[PDB]
Write an enzyme that holds these catalytic residues in place. Structure first.
Site, PDB file in Angstrom:
ATOM      1  N   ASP A 181       0.826  -1.197   0.000  1.00 10.08           N
ATOM      2  CA  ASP A 181       0.000   0.000   0.000  1.00 10.08           C
ATOM      3  C   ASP A 181       0.867   1.257   0.000  1.00 10.08           C
ATOM      4  O   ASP A 181       1.956   1.292   0.582  1.00 10.08           O
ATOM      5  CB  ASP A 181      -0.926  -0.003   1.221  1.00 10.08           C
ATOM      6  CG  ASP A 181      -2.242   0.718   0.955  1.00 10.08           C
ATOM      7  OD1 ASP A 181      -2.359   1.365  -0.113  1.00 10.08           O
ATOM      8  OD2 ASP A 181      -3.151   0.639   1.816  1.00 10.08           O
ATOM      9  N   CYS A 215      -8.000  -2.373  -4.934  1.00  4.84           N
ATOM     10  CA  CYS A 215      -6.991  -2.670  -3.928  1.00  4.84           C
ATOM     11  C   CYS A 215      -7.740  -2.670  -2.604  1.00  4.84           C
ATOM     12  O   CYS A 215      -8.792  -3.311  -2.507  1.00  4.84           O
ATOM     13  CB  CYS A 215      -5.835  -1.673  -3.958  1.00  4.84           C
ATOM     14  SG  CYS A 215      -6.366   0.029  -4.277  1.00  4.84           S
ATOM     15  N   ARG A 221      -3.199   2.145  -5.709  1.00  5.27           N
ATOM     16  CA  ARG A 221      -2.684   1.141  -6.636  1.00  5.27           C
ATOM     17  C   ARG A 221      -3.640   0.928  -7.805  1.00  5.27           C
ATOM     18  O   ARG A 221      -3.195   0.779  -8.949  1.00  5.27           O
ATOM     19  CB  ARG A 221      -2.421  -0.179  -5.886  1.00  5.27           C
ATOM     20  CG  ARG A 221      -1.267  -0.070  -4.860  1.00  5.27           C
ATOM     21  CD  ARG A 221      -1.250  -1.251  -3.883  1.00  5.27           C
ATOM     22  NE  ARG A 221      -2.289  -1.104  -2.857  1.00  5.27           N
ATOM     23  CZ  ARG A 221      -2.413  -1.912  -1.803  1.00  5.27           C
ATOM     24  NH1 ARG A 221      -1.552  -2.925  -1.628  1.00  5.27           N
ATOM     25  NH2 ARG A 221      -3.390  -1.707  -0.927  1.00  5.27           N
ATOM     26  N   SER A 222      -4.959   0.913  -7.541  1.00  5.79           N
ATOM     27  CA  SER A 222      -5.930   0.795  -8.630  1.00  5.79           C
ATOM     28  C   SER A 222      -5.799   1.934  -9.638  1.00  5.79           C
ATOM     29  O   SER A 222      -5.915   1.714 -10.851  1.00  5.79           O
ATOM     30  CB  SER A 222      -7.366   0.743  -8.080  1.00  5.79           C
ATOM     31  OG  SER A 222      -7.532  -0.366  -7.194  1.00  5.79           O
ATOM     32  N   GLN A 262      -2.360   7.917  -5.124  1.00  4.76           N
ATOM     33  CA  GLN A 262      -2.410   8.464  -3.780  1.00  4.76           C
ATOM     34  C   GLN A 262      -1.100   9.075  -3.305  1.00  4.76           C
ATOM     35  O   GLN A 262      -1.104   9.771  -2.281  1.00  4.76           O
ATOM     36  CB  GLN A 262      -2.879   7.374  -2.814  1.00  4.76           C
ATOM     37  CG  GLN A 262      -4.397   7.267  -2.799  1.00  4.76           C
ATOM     38  CD  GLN A 262      -5.037   8.474  -2.118  1.00  4.76           C
ATOM     39  OE1 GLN A 262      -5.091   8.534  -0.885  1.00  4.76           O
ATOM     40  NE2 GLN A 262      -5.500   9.457  -2.916  1.00  4.76           N
TER      41      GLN A 262
HETATM   42  O1  VO4 Z   1      -5.711   0.155  -1.226  1.00  4.15           O
HETATM   43  V1  VO4 Z   1      -5.288   1.430  -2.411  1.00  4.15           V
HETATM   44  O2  VO4 Z   1      -4.726   2.507  -1.075  1.00  4.15           O
HETATM   45  O3  VO4 Z   1      -3.698   1.361  -3.225  1.00  4.15           O
HETATM   46  O4  VO4 Z   1      -6.483   2.686  -2.876  1.00  4.15           O
END
Ligand code: VO4
Ligand code: MG
Ligand code: MG
Length: 298
Positions: A181, A215, A221-222, A262
């Site tokens: 993450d 994710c 990540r998505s 993010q």
């Molecule tokens: O679980 V993700 O933080 O990469 O939106």
């Protein structure tokens, strides 16, 4: 080509943080009134990650159509994705209902069920062939058919059955097991090797419903995965890498779901993945074998 120039300027000027905060400041803001209804509090994994009303996926049940999932419809690239949170213990039925109703063929999972000592995702698919799952609320049955485990990702064949109609579908599960993450993947090579296995499966074909990408929150990540794929598809369509404006594509994606990508390092990685993938798009097919080698998948 011109994303390469911009990459250098940002790097040799150390301004990835400022570039990324620019994207955050300019990103769309749309209401999420349905996600915030009190009856949907327990359908949301994170208080601050919600689908916009205008692009949210509606379940085809009449009691409560809410799921924390967004349709990212990239008009110019002519590809759609469904980005969603990792299902909760009470929304795994909803998740597979969505897959069924949207006619998705592939699910891309970029997280692990347990990360940093916390449950980031429910165990929403069966781990053993002989232990199928039945989702009694949505009347769906899910069976593990086979599993190909590689060093940093796993591909699974699932059978999804609509028990009302007894119709069955093959669902392909692409599970990136090596992507923590809030970070960028290890190397563009292993990321691109994974992305191209998703592509070659046919799961991204317009003949099927949108691929489901998640994710834990469905944005970081998505968002990285989708931004890289859409950018490569855009330059493929035009066979012109220099015509692709990565920040503009991300800003377009953020009209459909908040917070996509993010961290500044994930943005920086996205440039790297697209720049490297362009080598394949523009006709150096051998580079794909090189990615396979460098990713050390066995
Ligand atoms: O679980 V993700 O933080 O990469 O939106
Ligand atoms: Mg729950
Ligand atoms: Mg459930």
């Amino acid at each position: 080509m011109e994303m390469e120039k911009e990459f250098e300027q940002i790097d040799k000027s150390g301004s990835w943080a400022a570039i990324y905060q620019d994207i955050r400041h300019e990103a769309s803001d749309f209401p999420c009134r349905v996600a915030k209804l009190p009856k949907n509090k327990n359908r949301n994994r994170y208080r601050d990650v919600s689908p916009f009303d205008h692009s949210r996926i509606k379940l085809h049940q009449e009691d409560n159509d809410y799921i924390n999932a967004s349709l990212i419809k990239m008009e110019e690239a002519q590809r759609s994705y469904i980005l969603t949170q990792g299902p909760l213990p009470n929304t795994c039925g909803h998740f597979w209902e969505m897959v069924w109703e949207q006619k998705s063929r592939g699910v891309v999972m970029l997280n692990r069920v347990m990360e940093k000592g916390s449950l980031k995702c429910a165990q929403y698919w069966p781990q053993k062939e002989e232990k199928e799952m039945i989702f009694e609320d949505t009347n769906l049955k899910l069976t593990l058919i086979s599993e190909d485990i590689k060093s940093y990702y796993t591909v699974r064949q699932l059978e999804l059955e609509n028990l009302t109609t007894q119709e069955t579908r093959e669902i392909l599960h692409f599970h990136y097991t090596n992507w923590p993450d809030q970070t960028a993947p290890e190397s563009p090579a292993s990321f691109l090797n994974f992305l191209f296995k998703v592509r070659e499966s046919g799961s991204l074909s317009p003949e099927h419903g949108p691929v489901v990408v998640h994710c834990s929150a469905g944005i970081g990540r998505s968002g990285t995965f989708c931004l890289a794929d859409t950018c490569l598809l855009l330059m493929d369509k035009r066979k012109d890498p220099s015509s692709v404006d990565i920040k503009k594509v991300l800003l377009e994606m953020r009209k459909f779901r908040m917070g996509l990508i993010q961290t500044a390092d994930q943005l920086r990685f996205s440039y790297l993945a697209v720049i490297e993938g362009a080598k394949f798009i523009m006709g150096d097919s051998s580079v794909q074998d090189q990615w396979k080698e460098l990713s050390h998948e066995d």
